[PDB]
Amino acid sequence: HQDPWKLSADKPDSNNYYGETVANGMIGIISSPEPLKVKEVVLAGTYDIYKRGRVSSFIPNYNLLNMKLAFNGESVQTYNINNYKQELDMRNGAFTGSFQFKDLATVTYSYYALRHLPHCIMMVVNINTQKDTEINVENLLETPSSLNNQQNYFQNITNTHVNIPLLTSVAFTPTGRSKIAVSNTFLFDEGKKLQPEILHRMNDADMHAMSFDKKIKAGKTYSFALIGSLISSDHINDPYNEAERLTIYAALEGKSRLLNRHMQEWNSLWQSDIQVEGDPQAQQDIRSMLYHLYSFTRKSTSLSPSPMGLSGLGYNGHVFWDTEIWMFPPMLLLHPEIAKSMIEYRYQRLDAARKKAAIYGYDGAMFPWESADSGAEETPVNALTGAFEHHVTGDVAIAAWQYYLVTGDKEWLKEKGWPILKATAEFWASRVEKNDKGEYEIKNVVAADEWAENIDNNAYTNGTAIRNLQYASKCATVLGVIAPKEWTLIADKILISKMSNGVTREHDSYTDQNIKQADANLLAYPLKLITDKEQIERDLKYYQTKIPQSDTPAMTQAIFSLLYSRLEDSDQAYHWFKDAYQPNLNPPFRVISECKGGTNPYFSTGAGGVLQAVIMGFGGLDIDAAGGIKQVKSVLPKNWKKLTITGIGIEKKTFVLTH
Ligand X SMILES: O[C@H]1[C@H](O)[C@@H](O)CN2CC[C@H](O)[C@H]12
**Residues known to be catalytic:** 450, 594
- Among the listed residues 539, 373, 368, the one whose alpha carbon sits nearest the alpha carbon of residue 459: 539
Q: Which does 569 bind (CB under 5 to 8 A by kind): its own copies, ligand X, none?
A: none
Measured from the CB atom, is 378 or 622 closer to its own copies?
378
* Size, binding site for its own copies by CB under 8 A: 49
In angstroms, what is the minimal distance from the CB of 379 to its own copies? 8
- Which DSSP helix (H) or strand (E) runs through 170? strand 163-172
DSSP-derived 3-state class of residue 90: coil
Residue 658: strand pairing partners: 642
Q: Which of these segments, 184-192, 198-206, 268-276, 379-387, binds its own copies (CB under 8 A)?
A: 379-387
What b/e readout covers 340-358, taking b as 16+ CB neighbours within 10 angstroms? Answer: bbbbbbbbebbebbbbbbe
Which residues in 55-114 contact its own copies (CB under 8 A)?
A: 55-56
Note whether 379 binds ligand X by CB under 6 A.
yes
CB atoms within 10 A of CB 158: 11
Burial class from Cβ neighbours inside 10 Å (0-12, 13-18, 19+) for residue 659 reads exposed
Q: How far is CA 335 from the centre of its chain?
A: 15
Amino acid identity for residue 649 in this structure = G
Measured from the CB atom, is 283 or 517 closer to ligand X?
517
Q: What are the CA-CA distances from residue 550 to residues 464, 577, 595, 597, 598 (Å)? A: 27, 18, 7, 8, 9
- Which DSSP helix (H) or strand (E) runs through 171? strand 163-172
Q: Which does 539 bind (CB under 5 to 8 A by kind): ligand X, its own copies, none?
A: none
DSSP-derived 3-state class of residue 163: strand
Note whether 323 binds ligand X by CB under 6 A.
no
In angstroms, what is the minimal distance from the CB of 294 to its own copies? 17
Give 474's contacts (C-beta < 8 A, 6+ positions apart). 401
Note whether 12 binds ligand X by CB under 6 A.
no
- Which DSSP helix (H) or strand (E) runs through 38? strand 38-43
Residue of 73, 361, 438, 480 interacting with its own copies (CB under 8 A): 361
Q: What single-letter DSSP state applies at residue 336?
A: H
CA distance 247 to 227: 7
Residue of 15, 237, 256, 545 interacting with its own copies (CB under 8 A): 237
Residue of 374, 488, 535, 544 interacting with its own copies (CB under 8 A): 374
Residue of 67, 117, 353, 447 interacting with its own copies (CB under 8 A): 117
Q: Are 43 and 29 in contact (CB under 8 A)?
A: no
Note whether 503 binds its own copies by CB under 8 A.
no
Binding mask 338-357 for its own copies (x = CB under 8 A): -----------------x--
In angstroms, what is the minimal distance from the CB of 42 to its own copies? 18
Residue of 450, 456, 537, 569 interacting with ligand X (CB under 6 A): 450
CA distance 274 to 636: 14
Note whether 400 binds its own copies by CB under 8 A.
no
- Reported as half-sphere exposure (CB side, CA atoms, 13 A), residue 416 has a value of 22
Consult the annotation and say whether 87 binds a ligand.
Answer: no
Q: Are 563 and 524 in contact (CB under 8 A)?
A: yes
Give 417's contacts (C-beta < 8 A, 6+ positions apart). 343, 400, 401, 403, 404, 475
Measured from the CB atom, is 97 or 553 closer to ligand X?
553
Q: Which does 374 bind (CB under 5 to 8 A by kind): ligand X, its own copies, none?
A: its own copies
In angstroms, what is the minimal distance from the CB of 184 to its own copies? 14
Consult the annotation and say whether 568 binds a ligand.
Answer: no
Note whether 358 binds its own copies by CB under 8 A.
yes
In angstroms, what is the minimal distance from the CB of 554 to ligand X? 9
Consult the annotation and say whether 370 binds a ligand.
Answer: yes
Consult the annotation and say whether 265 binds a ligand.
Answer: no
Measured from the CB atom, is 10 or 238 closer to its own copies?
238
CA distance 631 to 624: 9
Residue 113: strand pairing partners: 121
Note whether 385 binds ligand X by CB under 6 A.
yes
CB atoms within 10 A of CB 624: 13
Note whether 451 binds its own copies by CB under 8 A.
no
In degrees, rounded to 5, the angle at the alpha carbon of residue 76 between the alpha carbons of residues 74 and 82 is 120
Q: After which residues is the chain broken (C to N over 2.5 A)?
A: none
Q: Which does 322 bind (CB under 5 to 8 A by kind): ligand X, its own copies, none?
A: ligand X
Note whether 388 binds its own copies by CB under 8 A.
yes
Consult the annotation and say whether 275 binds a ligand.
Answer: no
In angstroms, what is the minimal distance from the CB of 315 to ligand X? 4
Consult the annotation and say whether 204 binds a ligand.
Answer: no
Measured from the CB atom, is 145 or 160 closer to its own copies?
160
Note whether 315 binds ligand X by CB under 6 A.
yes
Complete edge-to-edge strand list for the sheet that includes strand 163-172: 6-10, 81-89, 94-101, 105-113, 120-129, 221-232, 179-188, 163-172, 148-158
Note whether 370 binds ligand X by CB under 6 A.
yes
Q: Which does 307 bind (CB under 5 to 8 A by kind): its own copies, ligand X, none?
A: ligand X
- Reported as half-sphere exposure (CB side, CA atoms, 13 A), residue 143 has a value of 26
Residue 403: strand pairing partners: none
Q: Which of these segments, 80-88, 182-190, 379-387, 523-531, binds ligand X (CB under 6 A)?
A: 379-387
Q: Which of these segments, 185-193, 210-218, 316-324, 355-363, binds ligand X (CB under 6 A)?
A: 316-324
CA distance 435 to 324: 31
Q: Which of these segments, 33-41, 281-289, 314-322, 530-538, binds ligand X (CB under 6 A)?
A: 314-322
Residue of 292, 335, 356, 516 interacting with ligand X (CB under 6 A): 516
Report how far apart the first and last C-alpha atoms of the chain are (Å, whole number). Answer: 28
Parallel/antiparallel/unpaired status of strands 621-623 and 629-631: antiparallel
Note whether 380 binds ligand X by CB under 6 A.
yes
Residue of 49, 157, 263, 383 interacting with ligand X (CB under 6 A): 383
Q: Which does 605 bind (CB under 5 to 8 A by kind): its own copies, ligand X, none?
A: ligand X
Consult the annotation and say whether 451 binds a ligand.
Answer: yes
Residue 125: strand pairing partners: 109, 224
Note whether 321 binds ligand X by CB under 6 A.
yes
Q: Are 320 and 370 in contact (CB under 8 A)?
A: yes
Annotated binding site: 52, 321-322, 369-370, 385, 450-451, 516-517, 551
Q: Which residues bind its own copies (CB under 8 A)?
A: 54-56, 116-119, 157, 159, 161, 231, 235-238, 241-242, 244-246, 248-249, 252-253, 257, 261, 300-301, 355, 358-361, 363, 374, 376-382, 384, 386-388, 444, 453-454
Annotated binding site for beta-D-glucose: 52, 321-322, 369-370, 385, 450-451, 516-517, 551
Q: Which residues bind ligand X (CB under 6 A)?
A: 307, 315, 320-322, 369-370, 379-380, 383, 385, 450, 516-517, 553, 555, 605
